[PDB]
Amino acid sequence: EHIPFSHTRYPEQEMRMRSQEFYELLNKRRSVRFISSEHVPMEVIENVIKAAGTAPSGAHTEPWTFVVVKDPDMKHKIREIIEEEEEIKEYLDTAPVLILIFKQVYNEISVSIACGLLLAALQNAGLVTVTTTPLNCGPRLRVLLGRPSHEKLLVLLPVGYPSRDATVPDLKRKALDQIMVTVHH
Amino acid sequence: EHIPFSHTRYPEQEMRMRSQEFYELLNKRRSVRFISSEHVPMEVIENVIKAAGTAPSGAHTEPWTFVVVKDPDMKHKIREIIEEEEEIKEYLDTAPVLILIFKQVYNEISVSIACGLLLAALQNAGLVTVTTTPLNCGPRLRVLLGRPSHEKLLVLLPVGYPSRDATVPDLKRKALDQIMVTVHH
Numbered sequence A, B: 001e002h003i004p005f006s007h008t009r010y011p012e013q014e015m016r017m018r019s020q021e022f023y024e025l026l027n028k029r030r031s032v033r034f035i036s037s038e039h040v041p042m043e044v045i046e047n048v049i050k051a052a053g054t055a056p057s058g059a060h061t062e063p064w065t066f067v068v069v070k071d072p073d074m075k076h077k078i079r080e081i082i083e084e085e086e087e088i089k090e091y092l093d094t095a096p097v098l099i100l101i102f103k104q105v106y107n108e109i110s111v112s113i114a115c116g117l118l119l120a121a122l123q124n125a126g127l128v129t130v131t132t133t134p135l136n137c138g139p140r141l142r143v144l145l146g147r148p149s150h151e152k153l154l155v156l157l158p159v160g161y162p163s164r165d166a167t168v169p170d171l172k173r174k175a176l177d178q179i180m181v182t183v184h185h
């Protein structure tokens, strides 16, 4: 039932180095809304989802389904439903792969954490996406994709290489001292 | 306002390799509830939080505060409040560092994604933790830590090296085919 935990320890200098380099890698991640049609390796899509499935989960429920859509007709119906919901996105057609992350019904926090692992793994693998959370489209997309009544759409990620002429808005991230507070005394 | 996006592309074989190795790294992550007192480098804690601050966020609000507690007396008061809340955890005292992640009030999904990046960065850096979400203790911990009324506690992570005699429950993760569904046609 309980087993000894096996752990790799690095010297302090190597911990500093590794953590600096991983930060630098992740800092290069941007939401990209111009995604090339070019095919991406399906072993890579598999490996990023396996990475996501490593996440912690409340009561070890692993309450996530990663729904992968490549079919051009289906990706178009997804786009149509999302656009219709206004009621007052070309990358949904152009991206070779869509990943839709459904929570099985602290499941929402567990599944969002898994999506953070997925985002890191895409960056590490040299792919891009834009995080979207079309929660109001959830019921219609669930039905379109034949997902059971116990799943609820959380996140939709179009995945591919960036367009050769992709742009991003010129946003700056907060400095460490704007996000980190140390309690003293 | 908009700038060309700069992107590193790897050959397909290198994408496969990188994504496999990152999965293998993350697969080694376990929730560890036996954390050594041994000091951990503060540059590493900084670098894991910087990594977390890379996350996407709804409307680029970056709505996260990472509250770092090292002080033994304060860590004990945190433990006392959590234990009192039953109403029907020694690692909160033993861990050299606690990180409490507060959301600034899709902020909850954005902040949970940042916590997935934080968990990956801790694993990469050779540190361990156990994800906890003491949401019912949120109001009392907010006051104890002098956090403003616009922050809401989401996640508490005790951080350190694992105990030399740490154990974990013998859980198996789901295989890829248990978490991934491909829509055809």
Ligand SMILES: Cc1cc2nc3c(=O)[nH]c(=O)nc-3n(C[C@H](O)[C@H](O)[C@H](O)COP(=O)(O)O)c2cc1C
Pocket: A029, A030, A031, A032, A033, A130, A131, A132, A133, A168, A171, B054, B055, B056, B057, B058, B059, B060, B106, B109, B110, B113
């Ligand atoms: C929960 C969440 C929902 C988001 N929804 C959208 C969306 O509906 N449309 C969109 O273009 N971007 C969406 N984004 C992307 C953000 O606009 C983006 O993360 C933010 O502008 C910061 O840019 P960056 O990801 O390049 O750092 C979303 C991000 C989060 C995490």
Ligand SMILES: Cc1cc2nc3c(=O)[nH]c(=O)nc-3n(C[C@H](O)[C@H](O)[C@H](O)COP(=O)(O)O)c2cc1C
Pocket: A054, A055, A056, A057, A058, A059, A060, A106, A109, A110, A113, B029, B030, B031, B032, B033, B130, B131, B132, B133, B168, B171
């Ligand atoms: C949202 C969330 C809340 C959790 N809360 C607790 C907690 O209250 N106490 C605890 O011991 N573990 C908690 N965990 C850890 C889980 O029990 C753990 O992730 C699960 O058993 C799987 O083990 P693993 O993380 O080693 O893969 C929590 C995990 C998640 C993601």
